[PDB]
Each structure stands twice: as C-alpha cells, then as structure tokens.
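Please complete every field before forwarding. Incomplete forms are returned to the sender.

SECTION A: IDENTIFIERS
Entry label: holo-274
Bound molecule: genistein
Molecule representation: SMILES string

SECTION B: INPUTS
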Amino acid sequence: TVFRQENVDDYYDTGEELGSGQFAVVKKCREKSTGLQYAAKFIKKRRTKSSRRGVSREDIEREVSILKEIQHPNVITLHEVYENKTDVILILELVAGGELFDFLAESLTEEEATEFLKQILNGVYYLHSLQIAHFDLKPENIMLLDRNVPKPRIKIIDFGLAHKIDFGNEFKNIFGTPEFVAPEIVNYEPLGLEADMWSIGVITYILLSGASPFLGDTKQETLANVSAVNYEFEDEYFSNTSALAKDFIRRLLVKDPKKRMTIQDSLQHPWIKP
Ligand SMILES: O=c1c(-c2ccc(O)cc2)coc2cc(O)cc(O)c12
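SECTION C: PREDICTED COMPLEX
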C-alpha cells in the first residue's frame, strides 16, 4: 500500500522530540489546518532488498495495517501516514505524560498498580479480541496522558512487533526485550496471544516491587532465566504484598502457554475482578 507523498512539512510543524529508537524517531507535531497536536514517528526505510538497516516495507505495512484497525481509549491511534524516499511517517495520537517506565523511576501500592493494570488489561483485551498480539509489552511502551493526577490514564504504544494471529499462532522469530519476552519467544517456538500475558505478569511483578523477575547481568543470562522460569518473590520486596497479587503473577509466569491465564482469565481473577 502506498502512502501520502506530499511533504509532511507542508501540513505539520514539528517540535519537541518524544523518543528515539533503532530505526525510528518520534517528534511532537502540530497539524497546520486544525492546530491539533500529534506525535510523528519517522521510520527509516530499507535502502536495498538485502540490507539489515532500516525497516522492511513488509514490516512497516504490517504496523500500519494493525494501527488502522485500532480505536480504543487505552491504545494509541493512527491519524495519517506519509512517506518519502527515506522514511515512512506515522502521524499518531499525542500522549504527553511520559512513559510508565519513567513514572515508576519516581514501587506502587496494590491499588495504584491495579489502577494501571486494569487499563492495560482493558487495552490488551481489545487487541486480543481482534486477534492482535502486541509482542512488545513493557513499561516503556505504556504512555500516560497526564502524569500529575492521582490515577493516570494510559495508552499502549509501539506496534512495531505486533502481529495478527489468524491461525492461533505465528512462527516467525519475533523477538523483543529479553526482560519481558515469554519462554516461547526465547525458544523460537510458535507464538500467540499467550506471549502478551507473560509480559503482563512481568510488568505486574515490577509494578509491585520495583524489581525485575528475570533480569540477569547479561542478555543471555536474562533469556536463560526466562526459559527456566527462574524467578521468586523476594520477601524484602513482597513482604506486605497480598497473596492474591502473588497468585495473579504466578498464574501468568507459566512456561506452558496453554496453562497460562488468558486475557479473559486475568480480568476475572479475584485480584482484578470488582
Ligand atoms: O510510538 C512511539 C512513541 C510514541 C507515540 C505516540 C505518542 O503519543 C507518544 C509516544 C514514542 O517513542 C517511540 C519510540 C520507538 O522506538 C517506537 C515507537 O513506536 C515510539
């Protein structure tokens, strides 16, 4: 699919940089015709077929196709797509309260954790209902609308690894951040919606404790820890955490994807259920 090839600078003015990654940079922007504000994600294109640099058209089109499907309060939305010879430029909904990752750098109570968690689960429920696996859930990819309120509202971002799961699983060597990936990702096995639920377990552990359950001193150690389900609830961190909260985590950090809680299970779990 081809995108708008007019110069994006004819329609938008850019400002503060919001984030920067391997082949993408995200800039605050403002649409000239409406005065409305967005985030422009510039994705660097592959310059040749066999290059390892830039993002393949196939990967870019997948992210765009998924984003086009999405409309939910807890997920980023897509406004427009432009492209030129060097970049595809996604004009995305602006979320200006910063990463959940940075908010955490400022442990939560179980109430604070569950208030974030419920919104995350609601967003993931929407996605999984559409058979969309995110595959890169982590605090850096959870953005707050406003960080200076008692109960910040959040939105899931970064669909760069997201896949449609029309057949129950995808077998593609999809692979995110070692701390957050499920054992089936580590082992290069077929992947489905279940991998997201593991990531939610890791996120929940971090929300409650300020500590990462599988983090080793090197990437290979972290990955080895993940595959072995080498984690425990340290008393120093979890002494005043409820057994029900631990139960929620324990039922997500399960090696066999088939035995892992689904998104629907997680919403009905007694720690979450109203
Ligand atoms: O999506 C984002 C955002 C993003 C998008 C929209 C917002 O409103 C806020 C941040 C920021 O940094 C990134 C950095 C990346 O490497 C990849 C991304 O997808 C993003």
